[PDB]
């Protein structure tokens, strides 16, 4: 009854409806099996294992799935990738992510870490074995993790190495924060996201104190992204098929997260947004031109549950650490939910 760390091609399960027009349902109908009606998780009696969320092939496999899903489901009017100018029909679709379970074939199982304060790297004490992960929504977004799980008890900082400025930081919140984004009915590309400033600024103070724990009580300062493509300099996401790009500078206003409190930072934070038609393809170095937005109210209400951050570094002769929203790539989104799981081979 021993096992070894190995990678194998997983298969997906879902509750997809074959009669639904929604694109995730459509993809999962033909690409996944029905969810396990009788899942069996068995505790591994007094077993300590070694997990590493930052080196886990389930993340890459989920990434390939989301690539297939988006390429199959999102039809741009024009694609301009290399020397290619291809034009096709671009109907607007029903887009709302659904949870996806990832399962091992015969001869493999998934070890799940049940430690309430697991940070994703190192030894785990409460190890269980499962055949399928829990259902994970493939939410594509930047700078902010949405519609995900929460940490059990405390805010969790996840990183392969916090002292390595090239390793991105996942902040796992324990309290969700609502972000409410609206393109009002009757400029068709102007929109906004509304955030409760009191609730968000308090959560940000908690995040700041948690980072203080990991960085020798240094001063924690937030700054906007130092550069890059618009997809990562802005909080970009998909709402009802439309590609929202939102400015998050007001989400990291240091003057509102100080110990002195006050200032008029307890009101509603309104982030200006644009629904973009030209989007840089993520599969391979391209451009996609979609149709203008549909008419009427375009609304999405989401749970901010995580924050992707990058630390500056190069400090030395300074007494503070500077953090900017964003990450290395989209696999971090899947790591934020797959940190508990790891595939092993039974032999």
């Amino acid at each position, epitope marked *: 009854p021993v096992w070894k760390d190995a990678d194998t091609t997983l298969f997906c399960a879902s509750d997809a409806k074959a009669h639904e027009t929604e694109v995730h349902n459509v993809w999962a109908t033909h690409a996944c099996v029905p969810t396990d009606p009788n899942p069996q998780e068995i505790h591994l009696e007094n077993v300590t294992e070694n997990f590493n969320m930052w080196k886990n092939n389930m993340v890459e496999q989920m990434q390939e799935d989301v690539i297939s899903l988006w390429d199959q489901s999102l039809q741009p009017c024009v694609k301009l990738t*290399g*020397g290619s100018v291809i034009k096709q029909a671009c109907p607007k679709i029903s887009f709302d992510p659904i949870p996806i379970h990832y399962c091992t074939p015969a001869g493999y199982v998934i070890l799940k870490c049940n430690d309430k304060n697991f940070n994703g790297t190192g030894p785990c004490k409460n190890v269980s074995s499962v055949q399928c992960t829990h259902g994970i929504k493939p939410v594509v977004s930047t700078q902010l993790l949405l519609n995900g799980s929460l940490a059990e008890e405390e805010i969790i900082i996840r990183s392969e190495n916090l*002292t*390595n*400025n*090239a390793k991105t930081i996942i902040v796992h919140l324990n309290k969700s924060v609502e972000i409410n984004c609206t393109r009002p009915s009757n400029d068709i590309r102007k929109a906004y996201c509304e955030i409760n400033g009191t609730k968000w600024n308090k959560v940000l103070k908690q995040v700041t104190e948690k980072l203080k724990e990991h960085f020798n009580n240094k001063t924690i300062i937030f700054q906007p*992204p*130092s*550069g*890059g*493509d618009l*997809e*990562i300099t802005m909080h970009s996401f998909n709402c009802r098929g439309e590609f929202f790009y939102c400015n998050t500078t007001q989400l990291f206003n240091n003057t509102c997260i100080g110990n002195e409190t006050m200032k008029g930072c307890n009101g509603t934070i309104t982030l200006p947004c644009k629904i973009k038609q030209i989007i*840089n393809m993520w599969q*391979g*170095t391209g451009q996609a031109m979609y149709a203008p937005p549909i008419d009427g109210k375009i609304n999405c209400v989401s749970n901010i549950t995580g924050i992707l951050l*990058t630390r*500056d*570094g*190069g*400090a*030395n002769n*300074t007494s503070n650490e*500077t953090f900017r929203p*964003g*990450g*290395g*790539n989209i696999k971090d989104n899947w790591r934020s939910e797959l940190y508990k799981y790891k595939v092993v081979q039974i032999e």
Partner: antibody
Amino acid sequence: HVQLVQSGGGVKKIGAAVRISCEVSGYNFMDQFINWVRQAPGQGLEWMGWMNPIYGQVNYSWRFQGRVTMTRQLSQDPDDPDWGTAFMELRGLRVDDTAVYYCARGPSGENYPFHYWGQGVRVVVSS
Amino acid sequence: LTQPASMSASPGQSVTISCSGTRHIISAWFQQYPGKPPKLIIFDDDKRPSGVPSRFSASRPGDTASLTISNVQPEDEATYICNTYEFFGGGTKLTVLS
């Protein structure tokens, strides 16, 4: 093998901007960050920042924030997609910017330590 | 990371460059000739790359990393630099007395 070839150095005027290129070969350009490290004559190595070729994400040392910009030119033709070129631009040059500038990258999968280095180009900032 | 600005040795001797700080980080070592790019000679505290003389060794127990050169040759006349991530030492110029 893995090669990093630099271009675009020389004499510049006080003020003005300089642009340096780092053309890479021997590996998938998207898979490795590009770091820039400068060295004044007879001084130590100083890291200026890195640039992720995936979305152009950058990370700048405070000494160069608001003065440096790191960009990338990705491959277009699908029969040669491993090709890539990184660019570094430093504006508002002063005499104390005179240095030899390198592009560097780490081992496969990581960013540090810098196993591979470009030949370096010299920049002088004068009258 | 601080190291002596320079150092001196005679051929056949054993010399040691020391870097303080490091903050207990794995650290690497570079050798650099005048007018040439730096070349990595130590990574992961003590591993050389291929083509680096076996007379080069390194160790970092804690705060202090140390590079030791045994059987010093005139080709070792160069600047040796300790490194942790993006931070580099000032560089120690090893002069082989001729």
